[PDB]
Write a protein that binds this DNA or RNA. Structure first.
Ligand code: K
Ligand code: K
Ligand code: K
Ligand code: K
Ligand code: K
Ligand code: K
Ligand code: MG
Ligand code: MG
Ligand code: MG
Ligand code: MG
Ligand code: MG
Ligand code: MG
Ligand code: MG
Ligand code: MG
Ligand code: MG
Ligand code: MG
Ligand code: MG
Ligand code: MG
Ligand code: MG
Ligand code: MG
Ligand code: MG
Ligand code: MG
Ligand code: MG
Ligand code: MG
Ligand code: MG
Ligand code: MG
Ligand code: MG
Ligand code: MG
Ligand code: MG
Ligand code: MG
Ligand code: MG
Ligand code: MG
Ligand code: MG
Ligand code: MG
Ligand code: MG
Ligand code: MG
Ligand code: MG
Ligand code: MG
Ligand code: MG
Ligand code: MG
Ligand code: MG
Ligand code: MG
Ligand code: MG
Ligand code: MG
Ligand code: MG
Ligand code: MG
Ligand code: MG
Ligand code: MG
Ligand code: MG
Ligand code: MG
Ligand code: MG
Ligand code: MG
Ligand code: MG
Ligand code: MG
Ligand code: MG
Ligand code: MG
Ligand code: MG
Ligand code: MG
Ligand code: MG
Ligand code: MG
Ligand code: MG
Ligand code: MG
Ligand code: MG
Ligand code: MG
Ligand code: MG
Ligand code: MG
Ligand code: ZN
Lengths: 124, 83, 150, 208, 104, 138
RNA sequence: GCUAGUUGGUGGGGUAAUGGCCCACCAAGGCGACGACGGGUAGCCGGUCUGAGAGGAUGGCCGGCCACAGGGGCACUGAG
RNA sequence: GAGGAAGAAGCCCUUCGGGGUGUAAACUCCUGAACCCGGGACGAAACCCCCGACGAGGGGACUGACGGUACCGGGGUAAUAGCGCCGGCCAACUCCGUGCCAGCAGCCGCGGUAAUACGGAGGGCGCGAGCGUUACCCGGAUUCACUGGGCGUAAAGGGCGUGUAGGCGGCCUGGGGCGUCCCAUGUGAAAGACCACGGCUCAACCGUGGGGGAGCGUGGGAUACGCUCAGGCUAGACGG
RNA sequence: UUCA
């Protein structure tokens, strides 16, 4: 564009849209489970991914993924949302933090324990 | 009434003052009108007190009122000597 | 004498009745770190043969780089295809700040302090080619002097 | 904490002799003797063409494992060197060679840089007369690096300083075996140094 | 120093008050090209002396009315509505920038 | 209109050298003439001279080139490898003395129009003045 | 497209002081695409972070200025 | 910390000969963080009092929260290590268990009985009083392109005119100097940032000193270019 | 019919 045009309209700064509206962008947000369903992923995957509807304190009701081998989440299970998309589950943009609130850490896990919230086991 | 007092600079347990000319009503470590010396109460260097008598003499000549301690440092730096 | 650095080797594919037939391509830089570099892009059914040709084509594609205390005598911007490469003269102790492809050309050319930037299409092939051209277009006060004397 | 663990294993990975031990890393046994292949269950298999990154990283791990410093510490020094006027490369080595714990080693008061570190921390060393137990202390040209009088009669200080008798020292230093003193004459040039490191590759590692 | 500006009188419809249009010229902060900007100042004319087309010098003065902080200093050149024209026409265009039109 | 006479001249020079002309004409103008002197003096062009092509005043610019060359494409290297208009109508460019650029670490030249006349980036620096940055050449 | 204290004038009132700051009365004016008006958002700065730079993003702590003291409005006393 | 086996046991891998963990451990010998005992601060020298003049000078006395802390001396025990990762990007590979399940996943993608990608294990790579995760900012992103982009077929030429505002504008002279350029000069608080010395054993954190510029104000100067005013010209334009 |  001519410099004149630039003086006339200038350039437009490009904004960025959040991938995780868990308000205040806050690192995490608290919620209560509404449902604890199971879900089938999109091509070319197949399985029963574990999901939960959470009624966030932010005033939102989003679908959170429950990582780990197995879980212990019922309805009124209060939990912490952190935000992490699940690639094959369109719609799931948050992960549930294991080890906080009613969500148990993953039992028996020995490797990436920081994630999955699993205290270190001692030996003999 | 304007003052010639000490403003604190340094670290915790490590004070270093600036002999300063500031309005009495202003914050201690606030905006001062002029710096005219410095003081290291711990004398960590041979140079723990400089003043510049010429300027200090000026402010006194216009109503500057020194704090008791500011006065002692000023004296020690020959500000009031007259012999 | 001549040191060789392999820029990239790739397995390309052609199609035939019943199945696809392969072939390899290799980019090789050669230089004495004394001011001479050559680029070669050899292709053959096998990697090794590919690299062989690469080297060969390179030695007959040498360029005279006017080093001046480990650096270039002036900035040049060369565009090759949609690839653009920028070369800026730097002082001692800067090193060769450049991406893998142009870096290899430059080091083997005996450049030790240079500033660069890859713009536009970063196709290694075309960037490799833009670099050689840049070095090739470099001139020296002397050269300018003879061009303008007469 | 500065590492603390199997050391003649780091030598093996770098495929080069790192005299971390010292006394034993001389008498055919630093493992780099009849076992110069990296440690691990796969240690003897053929290695693949290391990636440029890999090569820069290994070289940086080499130089840094020599002075036995942490990455945090090591990095800060590099930065200090990038700022400083002059070739941000030789300077960097110079700074490393100025660490007290290192100079203590270069003057042979200790056998290794690890052993030299403990000697400083335990206060058996002195700069310009005053005690100093800071391994990271930077020795400036002109400083005198002696041994605590109260230490001059230490089983270890005698033995090491004894064996130093007759041996020459870095062109930039100067020992006094008798009085157990020494002087940091000048920052060594790269020419004065002679370690298995390609400094440039380290600068490159931190440009990425 | 009290600011002194220079502009054209584009309104003598106020009792002892003239509207002076002042033009500024300067490099654009980011794009460089020299752009032209301007502002109308209400100045003081106690004698109702100055009139349209009048190019004058305006000087920073002690408040005279709300938004009237300048007194006319002197005449630079008289009559020249060519300027008041551009101004007047420009304002006319505005009639055709709403819901209706204004030919051409 | 012509809009930018100076640019028109730089381009005629550019276009002509690209097809290796002997010389090339450019509608004459004082200002343009001052530019040419710098080009001549600098050895970018053999020289120039006023001419009256069909009544009107022009300026024959005599172009320079390197020697014939080896291999395919024996065409001579250009003396004027680059000639770029910097300041232009509607986007004028001015620089202070400390803002005068250094074309190709000195191998090139920048032509400024200062209140002390038209000068090269070095000349200008010497006379300690700045002005409109007309163009760069190398 | 906006405007009636609205824009300007005379006189007054008020204040340390200019001023539609307020009031009488006279004039029709004033502002707007070089956006007025309306809506949204936000204390501003020294500076901080990033960037080769130009830029981009930002004010926590510290220093300067401003604003507020449950929400509005109001004067009194005083150099303030 | 130094020494310490052609290299225990256990665990892992095995072609089954052996290879790993690994000088690592065990042990031997040194040094002694913690602790224990002593000593024990600077920060505080004024106000005031006496002399002298309630001055200048000169004496005198009081006052320490932190703190019995900092530091100093003596004695003195081998004395916490975790966390992430190992398909490519991206440093780091094997066994078993799983069977498109259970699950991983930043992007590309892994799992359908021979999975270096899942879970465990051995080994390995990074950092290490931290490692990881999430969130947000700049970067890379010349991916809003002033520096530094584009629009025939990739996203992009308005369906075409007429023409308002505006932007831009040929060749000579001469005024004026608005833009522009130059010299002086005021301003550019302190912190901060850069540099040089210093003070805490280093550093972090501090002081002290030095250098700096845009911006704007003022005074003076220049006039090539842009601007403006005044003349002129005929190649652009229009007319006959 | 789906995934390679
Ligand atoms: K090209
Ligand atoms: K209107
Ligand atoms: K800012
Ligand atoms: K006295
Ligand atoms: K695995
Ligand atoms: K970004
Ligand atoms: Mg959230
Ligand atoms: Mg499905
Ligand atoms: Mg699948
Ligand atoms: Mg994510
Ligand atoms: Mg999925
Ligand atoms: Mg007072
Ligand atoms: Mg006040
Ligand atoms: Mg105040
Ligand atoms: Mg391949
Ligand atoms: Mg050459
Ligand atoms: Mg081509
Ligand atoms: Mg292109
Ligand atoms: Mg691209
Ligand atoms: Mg440096
Ligand atoms: Mg009035
Ligand atoms: Mg007047
Ligand atoms: Mg050109
Ligand atoms: Mg300027
Ligand atoms: Mg009044
Ligand atoms: Mg009054
Ligand atoms: Mg009003
Ligand atoms: Mg009034
Ligand atoms: Mg305006
Ligand atoms: Mg707010
Ligand atoms: Mg950048
Ligand atoms: Mg950028
Ligand atoms: Mg801001
Ligand atoms: Mg309020
Ligand atoms: Mg409240
Ligand atoms: Mg109230
Ligand atoms: Mg209130
Ligand atoms: Mg009072
Ligand atoms: Mg050991
Ligand atoms: Mg004390
Ligand atoms: Mg008495
Ligand atoms: Mg008395
Ligand atoms: Mg006294
Ligand atoms: Mg008291
Ligand atoms: Mg002790
Ligand atoms: Mg790898
Ligand atoms: Mg994992
Ligand atoms: Mg630490
Ligand atoms: Mg950008
Ligand atoms: Mg984008
Ligand atoms: Mg552009
Ligand atoms: Mg594009
Ligand atoms: Mg299209
Ligand atoms: Mg069309
Ligand atoms: Mg269309
Ligand atoms: Mg038209
Ligand atoms: Mg027009
Ligand atoms: Mg013109
Ligand atoms: Mg001027
Ligand atoms: Mg200035
Ligand atoms: Mg400042
Ligand atoms: Mg120090
Ligand atoms: Mg300073
Ligand atoms: Mg004319
Ligand atoms: Mg069917
Ligand atoms: Mg499938
Ligand atoms: Zn070793």
């Amino acid at each position: 564009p001519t410099i004149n045009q630039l003086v006339r309209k200038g350039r437009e700064k490009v904004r960025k849209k959040s991938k995780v509206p868990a308000l205040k962008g806050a690192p995490f947000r608290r919620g209560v489970c509404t449902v604890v369903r199971t879900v089938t992923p999109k091509k070319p995957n197949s399985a029963l991914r574990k999901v939960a509807k959470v009624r966030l304190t932010s005033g939102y009701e989003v679908t959170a993924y429950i990582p780990g081998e197995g879980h212990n989440l019922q309805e009124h299970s209060v939990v912490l949302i952190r935000g992490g998309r699940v690639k094959d589950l369109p719609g799931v943009r948050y992960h549930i933090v294991r080890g906080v609130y009613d969500a148990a850490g993953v039992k028996d896990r020995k490797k990436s324990r920081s994630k999955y919230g699993t205290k270190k086991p001692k030996e003999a | 009434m304007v003052k010639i007092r000490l403003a604190r600079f340094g670290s915790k347990h490590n004070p270093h003052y600036r002999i300063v000319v500031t309005d009495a009503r202003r914050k201690r470590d606030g905006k001062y009108i002029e710096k005219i010396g410095y003081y290291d109460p711990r004398k960590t260097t041979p140079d723990w007190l400089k003043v510049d008598v010429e300027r200090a003499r000026y402010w006194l000549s216009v109503g500057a009122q020194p704090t008791d301690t500011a006065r002692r440092l000023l004296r020690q730096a020959g500000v009031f000597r007259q012999e | 004498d001549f040191e060789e650095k392999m820029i990239l080797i790739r397995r390309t594919a052609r199609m035939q009745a019943g199945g696809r037939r392969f072939r390899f391509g290799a980019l090789v830089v050669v230089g004495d770190r004394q001011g001479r570099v050559g680029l070669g892009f050899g292709k053959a059914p096998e990697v090794p043969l590919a690299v062989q040709k690469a080297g060969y084509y390179a030695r007959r594609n040498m360029v005279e780089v006017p080093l001046q205390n480990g650096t270039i005598p002036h900035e040049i911007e060369v565009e090759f295809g949609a690839s653009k490469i920028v070369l800026k003269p730097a002082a001692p102790g800067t090193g060769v700040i450049a991406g893998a492809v142009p870096r290899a050309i430059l080091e083997l050319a005996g450049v030790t302090d240079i500033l660069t930037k890859e713009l536009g299409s970063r196709n290694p092939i075309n960037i490799a080619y833009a670099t050689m051209e840049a070095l090739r277009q470099l001139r020296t006060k002397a050269d300018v002097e003879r061009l303008r004397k007469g | 904490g500065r590492y603390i663990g199997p050391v003649c294993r780091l030598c093996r990975r770098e495929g080069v002799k790192l005299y971390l031990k010292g006394e034993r890393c001389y008498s055919p046994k630093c493992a780099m003797e009849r076992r110069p292949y990296p440690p691990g269950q796969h240690g003897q298999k053929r290695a693949r063409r290391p990636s440029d990154y890999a090569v820069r990283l290994r070289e940086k791990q080499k130089l840094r494992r020599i002075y036995g410093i942490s990455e945090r510490q090591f990095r800060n020094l590099f930065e200090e060197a990038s700022k400083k006027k002059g070739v941000t490369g030789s300077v960097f080595l110079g700074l490393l060679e100025s660490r007290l714990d290192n100079v203590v080693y270069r003057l042979g008061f200790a056998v290794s840089r690890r052993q030299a570190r403990q000697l400083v921390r335990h206060g058996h060393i002195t700069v310009n007369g005053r005690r100093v137990d800071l391994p990271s202390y930077r020795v400036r040209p002109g400083d005198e690096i002696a041994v605590a009088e109260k230490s001059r009669n230490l089983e270890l200080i005698r033995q090491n300083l004894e064996a130093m008798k007759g041996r020459k020292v870095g062109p930039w230093l100067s020992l006094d075996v008798e009085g157990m003193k020494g002087k940091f004459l000048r920052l060594p040039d790269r020419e004065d140094l002679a370690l298995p490191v390609n400094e440039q590759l380290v600068i490159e590692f931190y440009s990425r | 120093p009290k600011k002194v500006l220079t502009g054209v009188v584009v309104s003598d419809k106020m009792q002892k008050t003239v509207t002076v249009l002042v033009e500024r010229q300067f490099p654009h902060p980011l794009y460089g090209k020299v752009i032209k900007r301007s502002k109308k100042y209400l100045a003081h004319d106690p004698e109702e002396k100055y009139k349209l087309g009048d190019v004058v010098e305006i000087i920073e003065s002690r408040p005279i009315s709300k938004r009237k902080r300048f007194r006319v200093l002197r005449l630079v050149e008289s009559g020249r509505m060519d300027l008041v024209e551009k101004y007047l026409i420009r304002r006319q265009n505005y009639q055709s920038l709403s819901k209706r039109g204004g030919k051409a | 209109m012509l809009t930018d006479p100076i640019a028109d001249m730089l381009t005629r020079i550019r276009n002509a050298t690209r097809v290796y002309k002997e010389s090339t004409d450019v509608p004459a103008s004082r200002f343009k003439e001052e530019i040419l002197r710098i080009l001549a003096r600098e050895g970018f062009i053999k020289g120039y001279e006023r001419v009256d092509v069909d009544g009107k005043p022009y300026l024959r610019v005599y172009l320079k080139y390197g020697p014939r060359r080896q291999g395919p494409d024996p065409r001579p290297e250009q003396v004027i490898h680059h000639i770029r208009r910097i300041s232009k109508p509607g986007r004028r460019v001015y620089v202070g003395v400390k803002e005068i650029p250094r074309v190709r670490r000195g191998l090139g030249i920048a032509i400024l129009s200062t209140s002390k006349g038209v000068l090269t980036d070095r000349e200008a620096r010497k006379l300690g003045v700045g002005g409109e940055l007309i163009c760069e050449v190398w």
